[PDB]
Ligand SMILES: CCCc1scc(-c2cn[nH]c2)c1C[C@H](NC1=NC(C)(C)Cc2cc(Cl)ccc21)C(=O)O
Ligand SMILES: [Zn+2]
């Protein structure tokens with residue numbers, strides 16, 4: 001993984017992309033890494049915000065699956081035609097595979113203004129792939145076609161998606177693993193939450209309601225409604241020397257200080273304790289104010305340092321987004337159904353354990369089984 005270090009570009013606001021070479025003759029495109037989804041989908045027509053798109057008509061190796069796919073999000077959507085093509089990864093391992101690829105032909109609110117990426121690489125499992133779980137995800141094709149070890153890691157600074165390996169130059173200190181609770185999203189278990197060493201003291205199921213996932217495709221740390229409210233009440237108590245407007249706590253508004261006077265100082269650390277591999281252990285990742293107060297420097301208040309609060313409310317569980325992954329080298333150890341975290345080599349954000357609980361309760365939440373998911377065979 002000499003040749004693989006530093007193969008990523010981007011930032012939390014706009015995302016992290018990897019280079020991918022699709023078809024013969026080759027088209028090299030910038031692809032958003034997304035651990036919250038399972039489709040390889042590329043922009044495939046002109047669009048105001050796209051610098052490059054996939055031109056199926058220049059690819060001699062493209063095969064139409066003669067099926068469309070419709071992907072709605074709360075916020076927008078994308079759709080296109082399913083196909084397959086040859087894929088290799090310029091920085092990645094020296095292999096070529098034939099993968100599913102959705103040619104995005106229409107979308108709404110998916111591509112963002114000068115993102116520098118043209119496509120999405122869904123790295124979660126086939127259980128959440130569209131249109132259904134028989135469309136094999138990219139990484140599943142990679143591993144089955146090539147003997148690449150079944151693991152990848154993300155160092156989110158530039159940055160590095162390391163394929164099939166762990167690289168020790170990328171982190172310092174302990175690598176701590178938390179078990180994958182279920183292979184669909186990269187679902188994990190949060191056993192405890194502290195804000196400035198103070199335990200939030202909720203039933204630990206409330207932290208994983210209805211799931212907790214590790215998602216490179218979302219910007220914020222997202223927290224279930226009740227957890228969000230309790231954290232904001234607490235973070236608020238800790239910085240009560242500054243009274244912000246509501247819109248700031250809603251993520252709707254910047255607050256500012258005279259350039260270089262920010263009182264980081266009054267903002268607390270957030271520790272999430274992740275379930276350990278050993279069954280009464282846990283470990284914690286500690287989030288700095290700098291990870292959750294994101295700088296945005298707009299225009300006419302050029303002289304101030306200004307920030308967005310990057311913790312937001314959720315009704316679909318906890319999402320450990322990019323602002324959280326950034327401080328860490330994260331190892332998606334698929335082969336062993338675990339996720340590893342260590343301090344990135346790119347206060348300090350900390351990975352710390354072990355913490356032992358004598359009576360450790362089950363913190364996972366079982367989602368009500370709909371007749372729909374019960375019907376389908378697997
Ligand atoms: C760390 C990368 C975060 C990114 S990259 C592009 C966007 C985006 C926002 N609106 N449209 C795209 C975002 C923000 C992100 N939203 C989204 N992330 C991806 C691109 C993975 C899927 C998606 C589809 C749609 Cl249709 C709208 C937003 C998003 C979020 O909700 O936090
Ligand atoms: Zn490159």
Ligand SMILES: [Zn+2]
Nearest residue numbers: 375376377378
């Ligand atoms: Zn059957």
Ligand SMILES: [Zn+2]
Nearest residue numbers: 127133377378
């Ligand atoms: Zn299935």
